[PDB]
């Protein structure tokens with residue numbers, strides 16, 4: 001401002017950004033096989 | 046024929062050539078176990094003023 005007049009200017013700007021990603025991995029597996037031969041019928045137990 | 050894995054006595058025949066009392070038995074086991082899993086998570090956010 002100078003004689004005679006008045007000027008005023010205001011400017012405001014803000015930004016915000018956020019990102020989140022999560023991934024988890026877990027797995028289990030197992031196999032078991034077997035064979036046999038055995039030479040009364042009570043032994044079949 | 047004497048007592049083999051059974052009662053007191055059995056009776057054979059002329060046509061039958063043999064009766065045997067030998068024990069043999071076979072067994073097998075093939076076990077398989079599987080278990081898969083999946084877990085995916087995604088998130089996004091955007092704000093502007």
Ligand SMILES: *[C@@H]1O[C@H](CO)[C@@H](O[C@@H]2O[C@H](CO)[C@@H](O)[C@H](O)[C@H]2NC(C)=O)[C@H](O)[C@H]1NC(C)=O
Nearest residue numbers: 026027028029030031076077078079080081082
């Ligand atoms: C499936 O996955 C599970 C892993 O959690 C395997 O076995 C589990 O073992 C725990 C041990 O304490 C027990 O409490 C669970 O109850 C079991 N799972 C189930 C579903 O009973 C299991 O071997 C895998 N495969 C299958 C179930 O076929």
